[PDB]
Amino acid sequence: QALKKYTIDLTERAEQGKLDPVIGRDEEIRRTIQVLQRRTKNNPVLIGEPGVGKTAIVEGLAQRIINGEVPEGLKGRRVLALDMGALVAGAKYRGEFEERLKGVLNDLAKQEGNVILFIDALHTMVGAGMDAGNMLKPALARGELHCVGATTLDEYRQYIEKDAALERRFQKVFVAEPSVEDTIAILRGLKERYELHHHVQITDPAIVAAATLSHRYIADRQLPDKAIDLIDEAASSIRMQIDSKLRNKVTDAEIAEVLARWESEREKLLRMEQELHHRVIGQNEAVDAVSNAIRRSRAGLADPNRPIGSFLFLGPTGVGKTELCKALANFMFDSDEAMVRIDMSEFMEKHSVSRLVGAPPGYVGYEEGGYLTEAVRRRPYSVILLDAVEKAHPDVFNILLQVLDDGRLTDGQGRTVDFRNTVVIMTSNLGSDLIQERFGELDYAHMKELVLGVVSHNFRPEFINRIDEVVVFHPLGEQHIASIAQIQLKRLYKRLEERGYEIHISDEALKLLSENGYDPVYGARPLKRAIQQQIENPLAQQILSGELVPGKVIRLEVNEDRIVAVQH
Amino acid sequence: QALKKYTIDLTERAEQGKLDPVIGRDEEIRRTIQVLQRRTKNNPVLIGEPGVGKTAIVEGLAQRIINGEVPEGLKGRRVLALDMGALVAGAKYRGEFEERLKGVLNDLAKQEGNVILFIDALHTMVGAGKADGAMDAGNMLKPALARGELHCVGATTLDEYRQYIEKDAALERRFQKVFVAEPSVEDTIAILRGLKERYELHHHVQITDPAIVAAATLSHRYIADRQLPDKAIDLIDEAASSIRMQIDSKLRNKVTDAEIAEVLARWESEREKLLRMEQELHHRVIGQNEAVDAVSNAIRRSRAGLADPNRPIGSFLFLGPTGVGKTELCKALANFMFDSDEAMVRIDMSEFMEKHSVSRLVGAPPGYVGYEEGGYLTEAVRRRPYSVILLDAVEKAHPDVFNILLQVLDDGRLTDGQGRTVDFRNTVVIMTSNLGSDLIQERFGELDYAHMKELVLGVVSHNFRPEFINRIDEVVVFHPLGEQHIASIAQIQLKRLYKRLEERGYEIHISDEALKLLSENGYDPVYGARPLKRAIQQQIENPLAQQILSGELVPGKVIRLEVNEDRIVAVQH
Amino acid sequence: GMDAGNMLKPALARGELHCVGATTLDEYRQYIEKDAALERRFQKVFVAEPSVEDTIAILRGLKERYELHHHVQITDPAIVAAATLSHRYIA
Numbered sequence A: 001q002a003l004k005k006y007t008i009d010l011t012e013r014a015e016q017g018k019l020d021p022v023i024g025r026d027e028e029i030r031r032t033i034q035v036l037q038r039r040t041k042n043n044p045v046l047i048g049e050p051g052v053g054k055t056a057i058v059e060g061l062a063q064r065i066i067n068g069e070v071p072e073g074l075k076g077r078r079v080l081a082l083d084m085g086a087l088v089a090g091a092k093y094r095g096e097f098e099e100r101l102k103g104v105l106n107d108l109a110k111q112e113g114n115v116i117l118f119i120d121a122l123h124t125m126v127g128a129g130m131d132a133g134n135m136l137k138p139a140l141a142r143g144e145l146h147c148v149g150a151t152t153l154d155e156y157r158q159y160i161e162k163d164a165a166l167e168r169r170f171q172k173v174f175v176a177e178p179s180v181e182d183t184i185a186i187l188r189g190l191k192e193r194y195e196l197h198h199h200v201q202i203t204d205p206a207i208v209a210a211a212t213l214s215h216r217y218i219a220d221r222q223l224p225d226k227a228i229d230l231i232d233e234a235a236s237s238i239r240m241q242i243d244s245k246l247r248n249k250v251t252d253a254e255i256a257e258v259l260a261r262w263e264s265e266r267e268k269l270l271r272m273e274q275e276l277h278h279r280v281i282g283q284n285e286a287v288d289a290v291s292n293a294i295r296r297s298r299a300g301l302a303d304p305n306r307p308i309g310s311f312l313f314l315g316p317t318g319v320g321k322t323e324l325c326k327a328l329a330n331f332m333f334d335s336d337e338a339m340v341r342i343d344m345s346e347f348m349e350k351h352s353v354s355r356l357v358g359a360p361p362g363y364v365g366y367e368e369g370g371y372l373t374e375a376v377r378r379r380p381y382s383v384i385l386l387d388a389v390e391k392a393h394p395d396v397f398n399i400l401l402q403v404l405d406d407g408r409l410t411d412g413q414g415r416t417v418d419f420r421n422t423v424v425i426m427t428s429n430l431g432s433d434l435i436q437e438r439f440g441e442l443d444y445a446h447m448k449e450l451v452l453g454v455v456s457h458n459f460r461p462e463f464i465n466r467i468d469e470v471v472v473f474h475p476l477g478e479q480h481i482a483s484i485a486q487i488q489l490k491r492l493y494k495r496l497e498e499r500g501y502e503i504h505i506s507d508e509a510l511k512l513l514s515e516n517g518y519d520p521v522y523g524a525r526p527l528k529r530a531i532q533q534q535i536e537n538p539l540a541q542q543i544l545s546g547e548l549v550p551g552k553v554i555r556l557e558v559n560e561d562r563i564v565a566v567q568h
Numbered sequence B: 001q002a003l004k005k006y007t008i009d010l011t012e013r014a015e016q017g018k019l020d021p022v023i024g025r026d027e028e029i030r031r032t033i034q035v036l037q038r039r040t041k042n043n044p045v046l047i048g049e050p051g052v053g054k055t056a057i058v059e060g061l062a063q064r065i066i067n068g069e070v071p072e073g074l075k076g077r078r079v080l081a082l083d084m085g086a087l088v089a090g091a092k093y094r095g096e097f098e099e100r101l102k103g104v105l106n107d108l109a110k111q112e113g114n115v116i117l118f119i120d121a122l123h124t125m126v127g128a129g130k131a132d133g134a135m136d137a138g139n140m141l142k143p144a145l146a147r148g149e150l151h152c153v154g155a156t157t158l159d160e161y162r163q164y165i166e167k168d169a170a171l172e173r174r175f176q177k178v179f180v181a182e183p184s185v186e187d188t189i190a191i192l193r194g195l196k197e198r199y200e201l202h203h204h205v206q207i208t209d210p211a212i213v214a215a216a217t218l219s220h221r222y223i224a225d226r227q228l229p230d231k232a233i234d235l236i237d238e239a240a241s242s243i244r245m246q247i248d249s250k251l252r253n254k255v256t257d258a259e260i261a262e263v264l265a266r267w268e269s270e271r272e273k274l275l276r277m278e279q280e281l282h283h284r285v286i287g288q289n290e291a292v293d294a295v296s297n298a299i300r301r302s303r304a305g306l307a308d309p310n311r312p313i314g315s316f317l318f319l320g321p322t323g324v325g326k327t328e329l330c331k332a333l334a335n336f337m338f339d340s341d342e343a344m345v346r347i348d349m350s351e352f353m354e355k356h357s358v359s360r361l362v363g364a365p366p367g368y369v370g371y372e373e374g375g376y377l378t379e380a381v382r383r384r385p386y387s388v389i390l391l392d393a394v395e396k397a398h399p400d401v402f403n404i405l406l407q408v409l410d411d412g413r414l415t416d417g418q419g420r421t422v423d424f425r426n427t428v429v430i431m432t433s434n435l436g437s438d439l440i441q442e443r444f445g446e447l448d449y450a451h452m453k454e455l456v457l458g459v460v461s462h463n464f465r466p467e468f469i470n471r472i473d474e475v476v477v478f479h480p481l482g483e484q485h486i487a488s489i490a491q492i493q494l495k496r497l498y499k500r501l502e503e504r505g506y507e508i509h510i511s512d513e514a515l516k517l518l519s520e521n522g523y524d525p526v527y528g529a530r531p532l533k534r535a536i537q538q539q540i541e542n543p544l545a546q547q548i549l550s551g552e553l554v555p556g557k558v559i560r561l562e563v564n565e566d567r568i569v570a571v572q573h
Numbered sequence C: 001g002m003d004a005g006n007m008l009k010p011a012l013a014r015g016e017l018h019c020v021g022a023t024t025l026d027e028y029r030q031y032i033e034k035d036a037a038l039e040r041r042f043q044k045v046f047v048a049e050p051s052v053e054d055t056i057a058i059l060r061g062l063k064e065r066y067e068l069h070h071h072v073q074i075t076d077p078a079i080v081a082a083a084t085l086s087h088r089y090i091a
Ligand SMILES: Nc1ncnc2c1ncn2[C@@H]1O[C@H](COP(=O)(O)OP(=O)(O)OP(O)(O)=S)[C@@H](O)[C@H]1O
Pocket: A020, A021, A022, A023, A024, A025, A049, A050, A051, A052, A053, A054, A055, A056, A057, A186, A190, A224, A225, A228, B040, B173
């Protein structure tokens, strides 16, 4: 026949017990049996994003036909999995696909309506050459064929809803993606098959950790595909750890290994203030506020519909604004430059706002994405830095209203960007003169009140109502910026060790470097670039001059007005 | 058995020693054994490259099966390969190849989990059997995948996987991407040390280990079509057959690195490089002797080996007006270092003043004007990793370039918006500017070169970043030439004119007085050498081509370019 | 005309056949480099287009061959002119 060539008998495979114990999905099998028992249009199409187990639903339907959990219109049926990829194989000659397809339809008609057909990837029927829709389509309309289709939602609305006739011949049985507990029940149903295949043991905290962590930390796949992937890959890794040269129980540590590759952080976050003062000295209040935000987010108490950090940095520039934020992105998730910096001096127009959100449909910057939205859609776990937010056009803060209240922002191309795993940081200088001229012997709370009054005279009442906490950034004294210069000398010594040199200094040279470009009105960054220029010009010039040798004592001795490098 | 008819056994050929021993690739075989010992997504497909040992991993897996180094689950498994044209031997009837293949698949199902089948060129098996009223191979094996009756192992390229296996659904969810990286230089050394004894016992010659490491390094440096380690194996075996011919035709057996150089150039460095550099500069880039010394110092400090090899050699910002030898210097560096005239990339920064600067030049995330075209810089260096990079007219740049340029000036390697790494450590990055060129045209006369360079570096510190110009090797001052250098460059242009006329069949020698009339009538201090070019064109070629077509100047005579009162006339004698 | 390659292409991965191939670079890049079932049975002997002077030598030998057919006297300026002008003007 032609059914033997192109179809796979799923009820014969269920009779041989080769299918899976499909546990769950009972409403969708009831809905499919509601569609497969009509008089015309007996054709359910299963619809859901890939991985949600639609072939699993049809395998469960075949097992219920075998056992007898179906009504008296489905006992003794045969579920035959038709292969659309196997009929369009020899597509050379005229009328070579139509003879195959007509042979399958005549053999399904010979069985007197006793065969349910199953076409997975039903969108392959539309593009087959006219071809495959137009021959099935009269038999589908009159209920003479019981085609259980199965296709992805996006492929369905791209290929089948485009064609209103073939869309009429099918009924949508929406296969929704399962919850976390349902994945746990599936994996407890499928645990015995893996433990009798791999011949290992599986522990139930590893199962619930697989379901929870794949649900939480993977946005590509969907449950229960990714959870079964984690369990099977971990079981194979334990199988090769046994069978090479020693546990057999899969643990949640194995699940974390497979998730990270393919909870001492609590004790780290208890000393998160120490970690933030490892790299930025001074400014205890901002470190306390940011660490409070991190502790509230990681402890599970904060609002899950708001971003983690929503703060307004004030004060003069270069006092440790971006150094704190780079250290925060380093010790939060990954790295110093695993963050997003946006120079808000660029944005002073209306098309500036359309740049940082995205141009609407039909205009120039449409396909190019947004600016903020692309940077967060690429890095959903990152830190956002709005550098000098006072320079922005006064309607960027409406975009920021949506950002800081909801954690969502819809770009020009109509897709939502989730900000609920990031930290928004806005640096400004709206009260630099007022805090620099009144830093002396004034407290923190009244200074916050005064600069908050000034900022409230600057900003809109809706926007300052959204901010979580407004820190002050008091100016640093001479010893604070001197200690900053000491830390910069330490990281410069680290960079010289990376270059491969051991260079010492005198304390008089340290005082001259600390007093080259010291200015409280411009920050430590003029002092930083003064030290960096006055070291990287003469020392690296003497490197190119052929003087420095790796493995010699090099002291930064002082000149009358300069610093000389010696070779001892 | 139909297996004994037209299949190929790898375990038998590994047990009988007919297969090459495989050394290395333990991580890839380990991940392949991770993939094979699953219950879902059983079948691996080895995504690799044409010539990186995709067949070698399955050969080494068969050797570990025969040697018993495998885990207990894979012991006793007979790895077979599948041969197409062997199965299309005597099958011309109506469905005879399909019947033979169906019998092979029924015999593989009869083995019941015993045969781990290897299918090289898996996409080719998907698209093989263009038959007459019958089936192909891929859609007759495809029901045997999703019935648990096949333990396939595949091999393909990344592009053929992305086209022919990622597009399908069940073909995607039966297969795993065991990605096979291209091996390193020392990996190639280890592999060539593995198979040296077989080639020596075949070709009756001897192979030396410095020749092996030289073959590996020069194959990694020079050859771009093939890849490691197959190109190095081809070099070794081609040198072996060359030594065998030298025995046969007209008495050595030791393959040295000189033999490898003979084969490879047929397919002493630093000092001669310095001499050829400083000699071929004055052939092409005449004048600018301070610049010749500056470029010579830069090349000595680069190829001395005392600097950092994690940085690109080209790190330069240039100064001077149009037509001062900048492009001449770029093409001279290309013709010297890379053995080709057009061995460079010429892009001008005069038009990237907007936000489409990094996305046009460097690399575009999906949606830009430079996205459906490839890319201007990173994709061009993907085309030419052995080349020179030019950034002309840098005074019209954009601030989201300087960060990319600091990445080049610090580390060289560069990741564009698409997420691929393009390295610049074998390229020569060149930038040109013309801001301080007014003082150079103004007062180069009666002044020196060092104080001029210091004052124009002060002007750069007025205009540009003092920290961005630190990683630049040397910023040059291009000035001036009055009589003898004008005579030399006019002699160059006259040389190419003499080449065209001698291909026509004429012999023209310029007189000194006519060249003085060209130097007076063609040169001016305000412009440079372009009025010399158009004056050469007009005052020489237009009356000369007026005269040649006139039936006047007979071939084969010395044509002295004499002078008129103000013109330049050609004479016959 | 199964016709020839399914009785020859097996013998290439059988050692009984020692064939010598000749094809265009484009037909090689289409019909052989894709056909990876036979790729390590070949080596790309890239016959470069000859230069002008190699063509002049080829034309001197074939001058000696061609003058006995047309019964004329091909001249050596005609050889060097044909090489130079055919290299320039016929792309
Ligand atoms: N309710 C369920 N009971 C048992 N196994 C399930 C269930 N849902 C999913 N699975 C398993 O999850 C995996 C998903 O396979 P599929 O059914 O192909 O997934 P899908 O939802 O059909 O999406 P695609 O496009 O087919 S990958 C299989 O191994 C199924 O056995």
